[PDB]
Structures are given as structure tokens and as C-alpha cells.
Amino acid sequence: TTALVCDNGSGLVKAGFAGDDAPRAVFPSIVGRPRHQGVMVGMGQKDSYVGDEAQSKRGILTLKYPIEHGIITNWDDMEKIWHHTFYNELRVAPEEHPTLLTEAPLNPKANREKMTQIMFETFNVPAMYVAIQAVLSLYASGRTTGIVLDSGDGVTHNVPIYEGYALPHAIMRLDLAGRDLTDYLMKILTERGYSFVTTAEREIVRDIKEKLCYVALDFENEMATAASSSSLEKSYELPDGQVITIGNERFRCPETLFQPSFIGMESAGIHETTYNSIMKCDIDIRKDLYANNVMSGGTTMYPGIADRMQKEITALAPSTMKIKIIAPPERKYSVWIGGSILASLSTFQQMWITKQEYDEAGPSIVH
Amino acid sequence: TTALVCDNGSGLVKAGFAGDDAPRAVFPSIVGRPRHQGVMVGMGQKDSYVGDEAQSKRGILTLKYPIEHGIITNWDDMEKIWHHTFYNELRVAPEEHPTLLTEAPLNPKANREKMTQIMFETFNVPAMYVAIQAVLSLYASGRTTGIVLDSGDGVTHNVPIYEGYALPHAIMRLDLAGRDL
Amino acid sequence: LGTMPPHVFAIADKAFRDMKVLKLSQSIIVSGESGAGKTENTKFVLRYLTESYGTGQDIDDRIVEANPLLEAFGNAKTVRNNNSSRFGKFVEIHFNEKSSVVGGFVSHYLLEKSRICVQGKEERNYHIFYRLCAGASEDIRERLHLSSPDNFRYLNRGCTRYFANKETDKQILQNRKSPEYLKAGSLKDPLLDDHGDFIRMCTAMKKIGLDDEEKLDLFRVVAGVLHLGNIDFEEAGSTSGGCNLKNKSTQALEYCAELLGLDQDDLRVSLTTRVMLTTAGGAKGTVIKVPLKVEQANNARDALAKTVYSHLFDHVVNRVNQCFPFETSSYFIGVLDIAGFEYFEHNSFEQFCINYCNEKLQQFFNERILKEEQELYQKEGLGVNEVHYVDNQDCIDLIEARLVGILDILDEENRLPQPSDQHFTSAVHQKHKDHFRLSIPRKSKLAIHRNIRDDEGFIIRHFAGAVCYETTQFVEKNNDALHMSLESLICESRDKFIRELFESSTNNNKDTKQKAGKLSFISVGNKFKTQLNLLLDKLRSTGASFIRCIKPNLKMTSHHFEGAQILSQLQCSGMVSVLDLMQGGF
Numbered sequence A: 001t002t003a004l005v006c007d008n009g010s011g012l013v014k015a016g017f018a019g020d021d022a023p024r025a026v027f028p029s030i031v032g033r034p035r036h037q038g039v040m041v042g043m044g045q046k047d048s049y050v051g052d053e054a055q056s057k058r059g060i061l062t063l064k065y066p067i068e069h070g071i072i073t074n075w076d077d078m079e080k081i082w083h084h085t086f087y088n089e090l091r092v093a094p095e096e097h098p099t100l101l102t103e104a105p106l107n108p109k110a111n112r113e114k115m116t117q118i119m120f121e122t123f124n125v126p127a128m129y130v131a132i133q134a135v136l137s138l139y140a141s142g143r144t145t146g147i148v149l150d151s152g153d154g155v156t157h158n159v160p161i162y163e164g165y166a167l168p169h170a171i172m173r174l175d176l177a178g179r180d181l182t183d184y185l186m187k188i189l190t191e192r193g194y195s196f197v198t199t200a201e202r203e204i205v206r207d208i209k210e211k212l213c214y215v216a217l218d219f220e221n222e223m224a225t226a227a228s229s230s231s232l233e234k235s236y237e238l239p240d241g242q243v244i245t246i247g248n249e250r251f252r253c254p255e256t257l258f259q260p261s262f263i264g265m266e267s268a269g270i271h272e273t274t275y276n277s278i279m280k281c282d283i284d285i286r287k288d289l290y291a292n293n294v295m296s297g298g299t300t301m302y303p304g305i306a307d308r309m310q311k312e313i314t315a316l317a318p319s320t321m322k323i324k325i326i327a328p329p330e331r332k333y334s335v336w337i338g339g340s341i342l343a344s345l346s347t348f349q350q351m352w353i354t355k356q357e358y359d360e361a362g363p364s365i366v367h
Numbered sequence B: 001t002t003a004l005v006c007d008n009g010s011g012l013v014k015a016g017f018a019g020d021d022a023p024r025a026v027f028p029s030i031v032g033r034p035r036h037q038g039v040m041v042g043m044g045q046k047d048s049y050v051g052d053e054a055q056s057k058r059g060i061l062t063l064k065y066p067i068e069h070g071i072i073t074n075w076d077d078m079e080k081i082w083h084h085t086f087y088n089e090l091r092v093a094p095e096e097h098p099t100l101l102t103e104a105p106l107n108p109k110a111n112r113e114k115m116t117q118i119m120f121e122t123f124n125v126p127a128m129y130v131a132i133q134a135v136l137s138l139y140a141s142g143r144t145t146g147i148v149l150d151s152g153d154g155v156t157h158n159v160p161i162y163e164g165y166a167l168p169h170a171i172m173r174l175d176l177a178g179r180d181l
Numbered sequence C: 001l002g003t004m005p006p007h008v009f010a011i012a013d014k015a016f017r018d019m020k021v022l023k024l025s026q027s028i029i030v031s032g033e034s035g036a037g038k039t040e041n042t043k044f045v046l047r048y049l050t051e052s053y054g055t056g057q058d059i060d061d062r063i064v065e066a067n068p069l070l071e072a073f074g075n076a077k078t079v080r081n082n083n084s085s086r087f088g089k090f091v092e093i094h095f096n097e098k099s100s101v102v103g104g105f106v107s108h109y110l111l112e113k114s115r116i117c118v119q120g121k122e123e124r125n126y127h128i129f130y131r132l133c134a135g136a137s138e139d140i141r142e143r144l145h146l147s148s149p150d151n152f153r154y155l156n157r158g159c160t161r162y163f164a165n166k167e168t169d170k171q172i173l174q175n176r177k178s179p180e181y182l183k184a185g186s187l188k189d190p191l192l193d194d195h196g197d198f199i200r201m202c203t204a205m206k207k208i209g210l211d212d213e214e215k216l217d218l219f220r221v222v223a224g225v226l227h228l229g230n231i232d233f234e235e236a237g238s239t240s241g242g243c244n245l246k247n248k249s250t251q252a253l254e255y256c257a258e259l260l261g262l263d264q265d266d267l268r269v270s271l272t273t274r275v276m277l278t279t280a281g282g283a284k285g286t287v288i289k290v291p292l293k294v295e296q297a298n299n300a301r302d303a304l305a306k307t308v309y310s311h312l313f314d315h316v317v318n319r320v321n322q323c324f325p326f327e328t329s330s331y332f333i334g335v336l337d338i339a340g341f342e343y344f345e346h347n348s349f350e351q352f353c354i355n356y357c358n359e360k361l362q363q364f365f366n367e368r369i370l371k372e373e374q375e376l377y378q379k380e381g382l383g384v385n386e387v388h389y390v391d392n393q394d395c396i397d398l399i400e401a402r403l404v405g406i407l408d409i410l411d412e413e414n415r416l417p418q419p420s421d422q423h424f425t426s427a428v429h430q431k432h433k434d435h436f437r438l439s440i441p442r443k444s445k446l447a448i449h450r451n452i453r454d455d456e457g458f459i460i461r462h463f464a465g466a467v468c469y470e471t472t473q474f475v476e477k478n479n480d481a482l483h484m485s486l487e488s489l490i491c492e493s494r495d496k497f498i499r500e501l502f503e504s505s506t507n508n509n510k511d512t513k514q515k516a517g518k519l520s521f522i523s524v525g526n527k528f529k530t531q532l533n534l535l536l537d538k539l540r541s542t543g544a545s546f547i548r549c550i551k552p553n554l555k556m557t558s559h560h561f562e563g564a565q566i567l568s569q570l571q572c573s574g575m576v577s578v579l580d581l582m583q584g585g586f
């Protein structure tokens, strides 16, 4: 009876039935084949270990994340994520639940067609709907207007929604966050005499991406206080027993999110893509887009954002106008608690694609 | 019992019962359909907002003034003005009010007949009269002679009246103000 | 039969021989408008059964004495009459297989919890708060941090006047009098005296079991509900949090944590946040806090105040149920006391719950008073042919119907982001097919319904008449959502008396992965539908007898019969149609 909200993150695929509390399953999504010769020869070893078992087995596998910039690595591994998750974690019956899968606002077709069709033919769900991750963060946020930031590894997006219609001519996709923040952190960690070249070793970087990084007060002045080294240099210990003491790079990695000259793309930072999306909205409406600027995801969890982001936008946005940035706790699960609110609401249970509709149209007419 | 004065404004439709003080309703006049895709869970939102609520929704609607060049656009939006005003503004009962509608001296027929006729069949009005807006300004001014100016968005008119006769050889209508301004 | 001239005791002798004939339990249902003697004539029935048939109870007197005590807790002032009950008590006097009287049980159904938060303009709140700020001494009122009614948020709406006699009025000190009491003094009634009824409450408290020190811990709970209501909230967060408190509400939060016994810091980060965890969703995690909105902090404070009054009223009736407990059982005589069709000139949510209960009682009366009785005229020698009743089952399956009923649109509005009473009113006529039981105010020819605009209320035609309900604060009244951080604080209060206001089946064991976090929203409209259909299964499964009490005038004056006031209580209670089926061929 009750529908299932399953969010296709790249992290951190998230799964839990429709409301009223925290996701039942969150897991690191990786598939890894064993790349070594296991000369003990039990045998009995899985051909593909999925997450979480592939995050215990670091260094004996070659990790492959299921989606790469919002596009599948192949649907053989994607389907295997889903099957593993549904059967040996949740223990759900496929014929019992209408499902909900998520996608990105400007994601290339036919990835939603092919998906919807494969999940209907493989798992034989009786109904399905696909919501964009930004729209679900509006319902979680509980406001009626505003620009939504779904920033996860490896694609961020900037969608403006107004009372409660969508503006088609102001949607911005930046490929800046978050896998490029992982790669940039890996590129500036070599400077301190250690290296993490393998797929498994990139995970060790991911753990330092969570815990140790910080964001500048203002770049130019944080660079000033950088010449003093005591507060700047903090020493982390890593699971191989080694202690790495990182300085400038501690604030350098998140600072990438402003002015991505470090990545080398010609597009501007979140600061300016925000302003240029607001001034692509209609002249009358812009007044109430200010103070409904809402961040979301897990890659917005660095400490000095959003109050860096706020102070910078407020300087470029019109005077007198109040720019209030909205960044509550829980944002990593925002999308998911959003999805829960949606699939629990009548009447919009009846805006799902039902089996009769799918049987007629097949992979045609999604929208 | 009491009569109801509803001025079919060019602007700016004005409504209030007869005697004594000021109108009870002023609103910009606009009807507006929604000009963008509605992503929200929603979904009770009006397909046509009238004023004043259609001036609380600027930029997400396409505003259409119901009276253009002093002529009704279609009676579909005009009736919707009437229905919205009478029911959720004035809160008037259908057969309790003798009504008063306004017009312009050189405005083409069958605009005043079809209006008068539809308004009698739709709202079931017990009695009705239609006055030109210049004639009403005689009572407001409190004089019995003079040239009268009803100038609204977008038709002005110029009627000379002499104690208290109308002059057919001197009535001028200019398409000079105010939507053209 | 034929040896009893009409009297109340001719009904009580009849509903005791059906316990000996067909051997089925009988429920006495007293109907009639409010303030009509349905509680006073009931005390005469309980004296008749324990003389004429039953070999007595433990003691008679406690049941009589403690009834006005629970009417301090449940009675208020309404537009129709001054002393009206805002609760539907259901007495269950138990007997056994032989028919020995083993003891009683008093409960309550339809408690007007909304009244605690909002008191209208000429209504009161509950009658226990006006007996505590009027009757409590000056070495008692300073200790419980009490003052005149204008200081409390839950007493700054409605009427703040005390019901007090001329001699009583001057014997209440001036400091306990509000600006409305300075403006227009006491409310005048010959039988309602708030300071007198505080003495007949506290004397009756020591008659059901309470120690005089234990009444003071009951006064700390009532004053703690008053000083909880006084917390005034505001906005917060540089990068957006959700809610904080006001500066003047720091002294009020300290006196609230002094009366309840729960800490101020642990309540300040619980009225402002939605606590959730990530431990359940993984193999390891943490417990974060997500700030609530400003309206959800005020609505949570109101749900926390209504939750304490719910369990204090159930703890008080358990103390009374303990003063005449039952033994082995099988037969039983129930006595219902609830108000019939109490509608006014401004009707809200609680008058729709009264009229919804009346549509179910009238559908009960068509299958217990008309169907069974005329089946007995059609079998007891005469053989009489059927006359059909005028059905109303379609009005019930408009109010409470699953997915297409009214409460299924009201409860769907509260779960929606940004709930609206105009959006819910327009959704009722949008989901409705516009059938004769329901229409918008503009479709009524009455002048009183002329002033209501079509998105500010709706008219339901009920069997006893057409009642218009305004939708101002309708969605707000249905919310009662109790947050999980507040459940592990008010139930688990540091003070033992407060903690012992909760027990089984309300309190129960839990363990990790049970498998979900419920009941979240809860829903007031489905709280009453769950307990109303549960009491409906006890009325359809048991026998019954019907007494209806009509007032001779609405001023409660002796020797005065008014042909307009008596007729309206006969026309708003089901009389003409039921006395048209019964006529038939004989």
C-alpha cells in the first residue's frame, strides 16, 4: 500500500517508505569487482560487492560509482544497486509498493525513459513517478517561493520556483560540485607529501572532505591570517596510522566554490550564477526571490557556507533589499524528507504513472 | 430595497450602494490567466484571478483589462468582474438591489443592450438604468449648465449640457487618454 | 404496563426487567438540549436502581458529589445557556451474572480541548481556572504564581468575569479582578458561584480520596498549563534556524519550569526544534535537531497544554473510578449525558463535531427506536405493515467518508506545506459534487448568511436544520501534533506526581527498529471519529432506553411556559418524522 521514496543520489542513495521519519537505508552506492588474486581459494566470493560491503573491502576491489555526472555507468550495475538494496536491506516486496525515483532538472534524455521502462519491466512495480531533487527540497523547506540549490556529488543545480510555478528561462546547471571538490582536494593533498592514487584511496579523501575542511572568512583576508600557522594547521590521523597536517589547503578546497579558476572552467562561482539567475527572472517577481534563497544537499555542509555566500550575494544584490539565506540542519536528507511529504499527500498520489498507462505508452510520453 | 451604483469604469471599476458616502469597492479591473507551468503540489489555484488578487500575482499571470477602447472585450471576462464583485466584495443579494450601470455617449451599440439584457438574465435584477458618465458629473458638480469631461483609460469624452438640455451639435469623443498616455 | 403513570422512575423499572427477561445489558441515553436536567434526573435514576432492584453500591453519595466536581473540569459558558457541559460523560454501572451491583466506572468522550487555547468572545474557558484564580488564598496564589485572567494568553480572549453573588463579590480581593471585572463586575446567576463551587469542589476532593497536599499538586498542574501558555515565541537564525522565545518570556518560562518540574534549557530547545536521528537509517549515526517554525512552536505549546489537560482529566476520573471499583461482571447499565445539536449564530469546528455526533445518534434512533419497535408491532399479534423512515446515511458519508469526506480534506490540508482555511474551503466544494446536503453561503436566501463570502464558510443541511460553519481557524484547530522530544520530557517529568499522571495503556515499552516513527500529526478529527465509532460499537451491541428533557424557558424560571422557546427544542431534536413512522395503520 504505502509508496517508497528512493532518492538517486551519487553518495548516498537514500531509501525509506513514504513518511513520517528518517530514511530506512542510506549506503555509499559503490560496486567493486575483486581486482586481486585471492589465493586462499574458499571460494564463495561475490562477483560484485555492493555498498556497504564494498566500503569494508577497500583496497581489494576497484570501486565504480553508479552514475557519473548524472548519467549511468551502465544499467547492469545500476539495476544491481537497486536489487541489492530492495532485497537484502529493506526486504520489500516489489508488487506491494508504488515507487518514486529521482533525477536532475536538466539531465539528458533518454535516461528517465529507459529508467522508468527498465524498473517497470524488471521489478514489476504497480506505479512509478520521478521527481526532480530540487522540487522535493521545496516541500521539505516549506516555503512557497525561492531558488533551490541541490548540490550533491557530482552535479549541482540552481532552480527558481515562484508561488508555486516554475520559471523555465532561469534554470542553471553547474558541474562544479561535488566530485570536482573531491578531485581538487586530492590534487592539493599531494603537496603535503602523501598520495591516494587508487579508487579505494579516493574514499580516504572523501572522509577528509567531510570532517577536516573549513571555508574562509573572506579569501584575501584568510590568506593574510594564513601566514600565522598555528590555527591554520590542524593535524588529522588516517586509518593507515599516518598523521597529515594540512594548512592553506584546509580552506583552499571549499574556496573553489567561489571563482572556479582552480578547476579552469570559464563559468563563474555560485555567487555570480545566483545573481545572473535572479536577474533572468521577471522584473516584478525578483523582490520576493530575495529572502527565499535555499541551500540543500550534503555538499553544502562545509562550515563557512552559507554565511560567506550570504555576505557575498548581499553585496552584489540591490541595496535595502533583504537577502536572507536559508540553510537549516538536515540538508543531506532534505530531498528525501521532501519526497516523503509528496508521496504521502493526496490527491497527488494520483499523478503517478500507473501500470495501465505504462502498458499503453511503454517508454513514450513521460512528461 | 436600496439601489446599487456600480460604475463600469474604464480604469478602475467602482462599486457602492446609493446614498450617502464613498464607493465600497475600488479594484484595478484586470482578469489574468496563469502564464507559466505549475510545478507545485497545489492545486486549487484560480485559472482566472480577478482584481484585487490579480494585482497580488503580478509576473505570474497575463493581465487582460476587460474594457478596451470603451468597448467590452468579450462578455466572458466582463460577467466575471460582475460575479466576483457582487459575491465576494459587495456581498449583495441578487433581487434586493435595483442597479445602475454606466456608459459613454458615442460608444457603439449593441454594447449597451446586450450588457443590459445579459445582466437581467444572469443576475435576475429587479430594475435597472444605464447612465453616461458625463451626465453623472452634473449631479456631482451641482451646477445646471457646462461642458463635462469623463476621462478614463482609454476613452475621454466632452459633453456640453445647458439648463438641462443636451446639445447634439456639439458632442466630441477623443481617443486621446488614458491607455494611450 | 398500564399501572405506571408517566414518570422517570417508570422508565428505570422497565430497563431493569429486560436484564432479567432477555438478559442483555441496557444503556440509558438521555437526549435533549443543554442545561435541561439530563444530569440531575440521572442522579434520581441511580438512586432508584439501588433501592427497587439492586442491593446497593459501596456508597451512593460519592457519585453524586463528584459529578459537579468533574463539571468544574468540563463545563463552560455558551450562548444558549450559562451552565453547559463541554464533555460527553458515559457512566458504566456494572452488575454480574446473578445481577448483584459490583461497582461503577465514569469516562468521557468529546472533550473540547480547543477551548483551552481559544475562548471566543462571550464564552469562558473551563470552569476550573476561574475557581482557582477566584477562590485561592493570598498565601496560595503567590506560591502558584497566579494573577488576574488578563495576564494569561489562554484567558485574554473570551469572558474573564467570575460567576459570583453580591455578598461573594466583595469577599474576593481586588487584586484578583481583571479590567473587564473593573469595567462590568461579576456574572450573575443564583446557582453558579465560583468561590462557593471552589469549596464544594475541594470538599468533594477529600470525599473521593485526595489529601489536602495532593490537591495542591493538582493545582500546580492547572497553574503550569496557565504559565505554559504565556510563552510568546519569535523568529531566529543568521542563515535561518526556525524559532526563539521573547525577552519577557524568560520570567514566565522559569515559573513554568518551577510548576511542571521539567528543566528550562531542555524545554527551550524542544519547543523550538524537531529532533531526529540518523542512527536508525545506518549502522552508526548521530541525533540532530532541526528548528520548527514560529507558528509550529505556538501550535506545539498548545498541543502540549492540551496533552496535559487530557491526562489530568483521565487521572482524576481514575481516582474517582478507584472510589467504587467493580468486581466480577456480565450485566451493566450505562448512562449517557451529551448535548443535542448545540448550534449558535457563529459556528465552528466543535459545533460540527456535535452535529456530526447528532447525525449518527439520529441514524441510531432510526434503527433502534423505529425499526425494532415497528417489527414488534408487526409480530406481537397485530401484524402491522411497514412505514419507511427518512434516511440520512448520505450526510454521514459526506462528513466522515474515507478519502471523499470532509475530515479527509481537512486532515490533508494540515500535512500540506503552507495550510490554508480558504484553500480547504474551496477544496470542499471542489471535491463535493454539489448535492443537497452541502452548499456555499451565497446559495442560501437568509440574511445572516449574506455577509459570509463563499471562501469563508460552508452550509451543511442536517436532519434537524441547515447550519452554516465559518472556516476561520478551522485548519489550525485540527492540529494537535505532539513532537517526540516533548514526549520524553512531559511524560518523563522529574516530579513524581506529574510522571504518575501517565500509565498503561498510554505508556508502553519501545525498542530500536519497531519499525517507524508514528503517530506524528495524530489528527483531532480522526481522534474523535476513532472514539465515536468505538462508542458506536458499544451502543449497537447493547440495549437502550430513551429519555428526552425539554426546557420550559431558556432562563430556567419556574411557572413560565413559552410557546416559541419550547417549540424550537422539539423542532431541533427529531420529533415530527419519528411521529409519522409510528402512526401507521393503527
Ligand SMILES: Nc1ncnc2c1ncn2[C@@H]1O[C@H](COP(=O)(O)OP(=O)(O)O)[C@@H](O)[C@H]1O
Pocket (backbone or CB within 6 Å): A008, A009, A010, A011, A012, A013, A151, A152, A153, A178, A206, A209, A210, A211, A296, A297, A298, A299, A300, A301, A302, A303, A331, A332, A333, A335
Ligand atoms: N559535513 C560535510 N561537509 C562537507 N561535505 C559533506 C559533509 N557531509 C557530506 N558531504 C558531501 O556531500 C555529499 C553527499 O551529498 P548528497 O546530499 O547525498 O547529494 P545527492 O543527494 O545528490 O547524492 C558526499 O559526497 C560528501 O562528499
Ligand SMILES: [Mg+2]
Pocket (backbone or CB within 6 Å): A008, A009, A010, A133, A150, A151, A152
Ligand atoms: Mg542531487
Ligand SMILES: [Mg+2]
Pocket (backbone or CB within 6 Å): B009, B010, B133, B150, B151, B152
Ligand atoms: Mg469614463
